[PDB]
Point group: C3
């Protein structure tokens, strides 16, 4: 509350997203080595992580929608970028597994 709380939220998204991101990179490394089983399971481990971050964002979006004021701050922005850009990396990774497999 409030500035400290938002800093914690920001960091929750960033730690968890950064985790998701190298897990998505592990998955890329696997498909590189024709090992699709590893790539696929890593693709789901990154999901596990990524939604911890997603939920953090959602809870933050929920507080705003309801009226409690949230003053942005560059670390929030950077966090959000990191979630959403990691989500999109993973969306790409999935689709690329599918070409790989042929």
């Amino acid at each position: 509350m409030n500035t400290e709380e938002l800093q914690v939220a920001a960091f929750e998204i960033i730690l968890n997203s950064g985790n998701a991101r190298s897990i998505v990179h592990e998955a890329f490394d696997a498909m590189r080595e024709k090992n699709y089983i590893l790539a696929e399971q890593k693709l789901q481990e990154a999901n596990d992580e990524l939604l911890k971050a997603h939920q953090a964002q959602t809870d933050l979006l929920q507080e705003y929608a309801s009226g409690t004021e949230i003053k942005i701050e560059i670390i929030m922005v950077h966090a959000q970028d990191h979630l959403m850009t990691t989500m999109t990396l993973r969306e790409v990774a999935i689709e690329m597994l599918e070409l790989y497999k042929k």
Copy 2:
């Protein structure tokens, strides 16, 4: 410019870009069916939908360029991330549709 006008601009962006994004996954789904012409086309629908969000974003910063003050808000950050992340997913999808066609 007022908090309500901005909230609207946001959901607009989020709404149109969410829609463009599902459309891009439709084009992905089509590259999986080997429907390379469907996919080509959905990438165009997606583009028609995105230009909407995109236009909204560009007017907001145009409005900002011209001196109007815009307090941020987490849903705007989130709207911009949707547009820019959706746009980039689409760029990936164009490139991957080429790859598929080989």
Copy 3:
């Protein structure tokens, strides 16, 4: 930090990441032409440019972390989105170049 400084910073990020994005697209065009040499090289130039953008974002974050106040403006959000989607886009591309080869 400091309106003039933050607008400068934001434009530095947008211009350099904009350039890195076009170079990444060069790498995609060069992939498409079967030319894996150029594409690999272009992915490194894109990186040379992106780095300038990442540095400026890092200085801002590090400034923020040291207690300096920073009112984010849409232009900054937009610049950060350009940096982080452009990074994500290089990342896919590095992978896609790999797949082009296989």
